[PDB]
Amino acid sequence: MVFDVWKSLKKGEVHPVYCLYGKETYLLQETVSRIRQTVVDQETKDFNLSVFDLEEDPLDQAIADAETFPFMGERRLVIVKNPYFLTGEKKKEKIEHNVSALESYIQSPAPYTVFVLLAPYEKLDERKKLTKALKKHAFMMEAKELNAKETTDFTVNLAKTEQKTIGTEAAEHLVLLVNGHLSSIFQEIQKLCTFIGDREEITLDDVKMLVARSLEQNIFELINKIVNRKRTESLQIFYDLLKQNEEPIKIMALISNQFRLILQTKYFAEQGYGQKQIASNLKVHPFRVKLAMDQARLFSEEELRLIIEQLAVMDYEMKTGKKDKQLLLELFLLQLLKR
């Protein structure tokens, strides 16, 4: 897990070869950053840090760097992004790398180098020689996209890394408020750990007082309330947005993005595709795809198409000429509530 690596780095356990994979790029990024903070010194970072992207860079140069002594430092850091040849994708499109030299390197790596493969794919091809070599010689870490329940456990465990705790109710509420984004959970957990001072436990009350419901979560909820005929609850959500000075045009764009998502999700769901395949097809986090799937059940295809076109018209009427922007939005939302 991400936590195994993070805890290891803090104990001074830094290994010569890592393979960080999975589609949760934020955790890949955060981990690469912690490894950097561990091995690189700012005074020598020009000399002891190298980043390559195998989409455009030669593997051999990354290896030649890895085999160079650190310069006025104890360790060197070499980062190698996008080993697409670890997957089963169409191999004709890009650079034809020297995989065998890489296999050789990870099997006998330079003791003074920390070599990190950053492979933002869900799955590596287990049949590939190099994949087998990594599972043996590299510290493998998967940063997968989480569902609702997994996201709660992640939040609970995250608090522990700061020597605090958070109960499952408080954690579930936090995850709800930030609409499941891990980057937001990480941020809010750090704020909460500081906030509670000497106290050990982040309470549900701490979460509610400190953590603001995200705009994107508000948009989601506004749409729930509307499709559920809860007239005042949804008028209240909309008002609060305006009242904290969100721009009507921005509110509209987010509403538009969600309705487009619902239509797409409904389209693929009705062909039997699951939360899993839809997220990867749409390049949207499964957490957010699940919610769109739930909402898609409450609208017909024809409604969604109408709603979407209404929003494109509003976008144009707002961007061009002088119509009352808030009024345009009021009318739209009122139409939705009668209809």
Side-chain angles (χ1 to χ4, degrees), residues 2-22 24-42 44 46-73 75-88 95 97-122 124-125 127-128 130-148 150-228 231-242 244-249 251-282 284-289 291-321 324-334 336-337:
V2 126
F3 299 115
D4 173 48
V5 177
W6 295 1
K7 190 179 184 68
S8 286
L9 292 178
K10 284 182 165 178
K11 289 182 66 67
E13 301 166 9
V14 194
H15 308 297
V17 183
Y18 294 80
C19 182
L20 320 180
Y21 72 99
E24 185 52 87
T25 61
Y26 169 82
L27 294 179
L28 296 183
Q29 296 314 330
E30 171 64 16
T31 300
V32 160
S33 183
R34 282 161 187 253
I35 288 166
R36 182 187 318 178
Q37 286 168 1
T38 307
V39 327
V40 182
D41 308 281
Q42 284 291 302
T44 51
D46 308 322
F47 317 121
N48 293 313
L49 173 53
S50 319
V51 183
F52 301 84
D53 185 339
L54 297 184
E55 300 282 17
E56 67 191 9
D57 303 332
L59 185 57
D60 53 304
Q61 191 57 92
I63 298 168
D65 274 45
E67 265 152 5
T68 302
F69 296 155
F71 177 64
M72 296 177 176
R75 277 215 198 80
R76 162 183 294 306
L77 180 55
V78 170
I79 300 171
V80 179
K81 302 176 184 164
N82 305 143
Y84 46 85
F85 44 79
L86 290 180
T87 71
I95 306 182
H97 294 283
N98 189 13
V99 163
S100 64
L102 173 58
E103 308 185 19
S104 282
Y105 181 85
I106 81 170
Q107 300 170 345
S108 179
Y112 41 79
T113 290
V114 179
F115 191 94
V116 316
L117 275 167
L118 189 48
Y121 317 118
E122 287 187 23
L124 312 179
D125 189 344
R127 309 173 303 258
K128 293 185 177 298
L130 179 48
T131 304
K132 299 185 184 191
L134 290 164
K135 293 171 58 152
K136 160 141 58 164
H137 293 289
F139 194 150
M140 305 292 303
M141 186 208 75
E142 176 187 36
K144 70 168 179 170
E145 291 173 303
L146 309 179
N147 57 31
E150 292 166 325
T151 302
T152 299
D153 297 349
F154 165 89
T155 306
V156 166
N157 286 321
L158 183 55
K160 291 179 185 172
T161 78
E162 292 304 327
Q163 293 83 56
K164 302 302 179 175
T165 60
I166 188 169
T168 96
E169 187 184 10
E172 283 172 338
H173 195 243
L174 172 53
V175 166
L176 170 80
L177 286 170
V178 301
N179 214 32
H181 294 278
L182 294 194
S183 69
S184 304
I185 292 155
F186 180 98
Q187 172 178 347
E188 299 302 337
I189 285 295
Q190 297 301 344
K191 280 164 61 190
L192 287 156
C193 291
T194 298
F195 183 70
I196 66 177
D198 279 325
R199 299 157 44 211
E200 177 173 355
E201 182 186 348
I202 301 167
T203 70
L204 177 65
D205 281 337
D206 290 312
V207 172
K208 294 180 159 170
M209 72 180 70
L210 192 70
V211 177
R213 197 174 291 255
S214 76
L215 182 54
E216 178 182 77
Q217 159 73 20
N218 273 316
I219 298 321
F220 176 77
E221 283 300 344
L222 169 58
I223 289 160
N224 270 342
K225 296 306 165 181
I226 281 168
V227 79
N228 289 318
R231 183 170 197 94
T232 304
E233 280 177 341
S234 68
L235 288 189
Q236 184 73 59
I237 293 161
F238 180 45
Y239 184 61
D240 287 333
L241 294 180
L242 302 163
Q244 60 200 36
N245 263 272
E246 296 300 339
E247 310 189 343
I249 189 166
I251 297 176
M252 171 218 66
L254 302 176
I255 292 168
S256 182
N257 298 333
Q258 181 64 6
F259 272 113
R260 285 193 301 257
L261 183 55
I262 291 160
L263 182 78
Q264 286 168 316
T265 296
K266 187 186 189 66
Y267 176 80
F268 290 114
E270 291 197 346
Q271 328 195 105
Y273 295 115
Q275 171 191 350
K276 39 282 180 183
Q277 331 183 45
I278 295 170
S280 57
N281 182 288
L282 296 190
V284 172
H285 275 281
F287 183 104
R288 180 149 180 256
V289 167
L291 303 180
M293 289 179 81
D294 288 340
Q295 283 186 323
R297 298 214 141 236
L298 309 181
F299 295 94
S300 66
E301 199 182 40
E302 173 180 12
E303 287 183 277
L304 289 169
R305 288 166 175 169
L306 300 172
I307 286 163
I308 286 159
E309 174 61 9
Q310 286 173 346
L311 290 160
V313 173
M314 181 185 302
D315 178 77
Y316 171 78
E317 285 173 339
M318 276 188 185
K319 274 174 167 61
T320 77
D324 184 348
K325 297 188 177 64
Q326 170 170 340
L327 173 69
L328 285 175
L329 252 172
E330 277 173 354
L331 295 169
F332 171 74
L333 296 175
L334 291 179
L336 290 200
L337 286 150

